[PDB]
Amino acid sequence: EQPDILSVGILVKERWKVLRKIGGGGFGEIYDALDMLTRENVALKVESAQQPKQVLKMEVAVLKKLQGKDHVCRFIGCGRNDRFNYVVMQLQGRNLADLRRSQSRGTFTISTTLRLGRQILESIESIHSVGFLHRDIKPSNFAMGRFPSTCRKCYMLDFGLARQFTNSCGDVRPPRAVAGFRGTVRYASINAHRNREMGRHDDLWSLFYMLVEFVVGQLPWRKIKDKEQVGSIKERYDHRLMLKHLPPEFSIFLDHISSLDYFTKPDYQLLTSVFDNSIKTFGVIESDPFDWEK
Ligand SMILES: Clc1ccccc1Oc1ccc(Nc2ncnc3[nH]ccc23)cc1
């Protein structure tokens, strides 16, 4: 097989010492590096300068646009050379995909589910607010922080598959007739399955699928490998069935996102109220242990 894009031990730009590969994402690799200017560990994403689909230009654009916002890594640096392109950003902790898989039945409690869900909704409204769609909402794109002050904060980790959906003014851009989906079958909306231009609502469908998987431990199309079979299930599926194990106000959430299309701005305050009201009804407070603490 092919070697890692970077050799562990090298120094990037006389500053970032590559320590270990920590992931092999969709379109590149991620490393733990030592930043010798700040004397801290950081995350270093890289892609080959020669690979057919390169997304780190999008990663840098969105990370920069989101600086100052919650739920996003601090931007540290970026560069392009004949061998590779790279982006450096804040290193986070345990990934939600791993935390969920460590649970007894791959389920989180409603306490952990509601708090994570509300943080993730905040992160989606934030990326939409600067004119980008995420298009790849799934548990492995979120992690908790790795310090006492950050480990109760959930971070949106990656923006590779993002698309700008507005003008400078906030005008929604005319959709393409066909849009070739490159994200994850399991959490993709029907519109992704249909190679339609994705909208703000498609990120909220993916959040709805994540929340259901958190509470139930699986989605109805878990064992189906064929993308066009999954899509056929989603097209026909009565999503009200997924309300069974969610707090009652999720009927409002589901009715709202069902009403949306590419050209309709979500009612983010309504969707936030579903989480706020559910959290109060269930007596959840922010300091309650998450499932992985206790
Ligand atoms: Cl590929 C995968 C699938 C499922 C569960 C974990 C996985 O591994 C990683 C490893 C690292 C990341 N990303 C990050 N991690 C830690 N700090 C980070 N700052 C920015 C990104 C980033 C994501 C998934």
Side-chain angles (χ1 to χ4, degrees), residues 22-24 30 43 45 73 89-93 95 97-98 140 157:
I22 66 174
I30 183 163
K45 292 182 184 186
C73 296
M89 77 286 303
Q90 184 181 4
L91 182 63
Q92 302 297 357
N95 189 276
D98 291 337
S140 62
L157 295 178

Side-chain angles (χ1 to χ4, degrees), residues 57-211:
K57 179 161 161 190
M58 181 63 67
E59 181 80 14
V60 169
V62 177
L63 196 50
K64 287 178 163 279
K65 265 253 170 80
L66 290 171
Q67 292 304 288
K69 304 277 200 279
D70 203 5
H71 307 293
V72 310
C73 296
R74 189 168 296 276
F75 175 82
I76 297 171
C78 69
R80 304 177 61 81
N81 61 56
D82 286 353
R83 294 168 185 182
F84 61 95
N85 304 320
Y86 67 93
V87 188
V88 191
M89 77 286 303
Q90 184 181 4
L91 182 63
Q92 302 297 357
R94 298 196 272 165
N95 189 276
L96 291 195
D98 291 337
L99 289 169
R100 191 188 67 89
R101 283 193 187 266
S102 294
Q103 293 289 297
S104 289
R105 284 196 186 163
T107 63
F108 292 139
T109 61
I110 189 59
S111 175
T112 287
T113 296
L114 286 177
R115 291 180 285 163
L116 287 178
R118 184 167 62 178
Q119 292 205 41
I120 298 168
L121 176 60
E122 295 168 3
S123 78
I124 294 170
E125 187 175 356
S126 189
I127 188 178
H128 293 175
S129 79
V130 299
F132 288 82
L133 302 178
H134 186 283
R135 303 199 301 169
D136 182 47
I137 296 293
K138 60 179 180 171
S140 62
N141 277 332
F142 295 91
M144 309 306 294
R146 74 182 176 110
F147 287 95
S149 67
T150 63
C151 66
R152 311 189 66 76
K153 187 70 67 179
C154 187
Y155 294 87
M156 183 179 272
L157 295 178
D158 192 88
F159 310 109
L161 283 176
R163 179 176 174 86
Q164 183 173 348
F165 74 100
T166 61
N167 188 235
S168 60
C169 201
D171 299 8
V172 162
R173 80 190 287 196
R176 291 171 290 179
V178 173
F181 185 59
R182 301 295 312 266
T184 289
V185 159
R186 179 172 284 177
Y187 306 94
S189 87
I190 297 160
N191 300 312
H193 279 284
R194 292 192 309 202
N195 293 304
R196 292 169 68 88
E197 193 79 74
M198 287 166 78
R200 294 157 287 193
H201 63 310
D202 294 307
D203 290 339
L204 297 169
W205 273 108
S206 294
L207 168 61
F208 186 72
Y209 290 155
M210 290 189 52
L211 299 168

